[PDB]
Amino acid sequence: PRKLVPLAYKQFSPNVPEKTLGASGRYEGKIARSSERFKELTPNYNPDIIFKAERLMTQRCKDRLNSLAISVMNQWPGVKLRVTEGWDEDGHHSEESLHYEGRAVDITTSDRDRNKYGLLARLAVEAGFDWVYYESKAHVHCSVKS
């Protein structure tokens, strides 16, 4: 067994830029409702995840999130994974955010205990998200390749 080490504030894993090939890969452009690429987005209705649209994400993102949902409930009995941002149609992030193509989620615990977020980030990496960034005290940013 291995010690699960929480990510530090502002740490990202792996320790490379999000868009690198060993991470979540290149930005592919915004996905609009009208896009053909919009049909690669699937809604996530996992009853074990709290959703603050936020539900629309790629299959790989869905798989990683659902895996995380289990691990969080294990880590903290009685607590659930919570999503506060998923697919963004409204330019609320940087120039080229993976949020714009349904390949990123910002997450917390259901109890909004910010002291848990570093460990939540570690669980996200263990759950297979291709890039995990303890971006803010308000949430952890998790993304996947396409």
Provide the binding-site residues for Zn ion, judged by CB under 5 A.
Answer: 106, 141
Within 8 A by CB and 6+ apart from 95, the residues are: none
CB of 84 to Zn ion, least distance (A): 9
- Closest approach, Cβ 141 to Zn ion, in A, equals 4
Strand ranges in 7-138 using DSSP code E only, listed in sequence order: 12-13, 42-43, 49-51, 56-57, 81-85, 104-109, 131-136
Shortest Cβ distance from residue 30 to Zn ion (Å)? Answer: 15
CB of 140 closer than 8 Å to CB of 120? yes
Which residues make beta-bridge pairs with 107?
83, 140
Give me the residue whose beta carbon is nearest to Zn ion. Answer: 141
Do the Cβ atoms of 100 and 30 come closer than 8 Å?
A: yes
Residue nearer to Zn ion on the CB measure, 60 or 141? 141
Cα(134)–Cα(6) distance, integer angstroms: 10
Q: Which residue number, 3 or 143, has a Cβ lying nearer to Zn ion?
A: 143
Query: Whole-number minimum distance, CB 1 to Zn ion, in Å?
Result: 31
**36 vs 90, which CB is nearer to Zn ion?**
90
Q: What is the phi/psi pair of residue 59, to 5°? A: -60, -45
- Is the CB of 76 or the CB of 129 nearer to Zn ion? 129
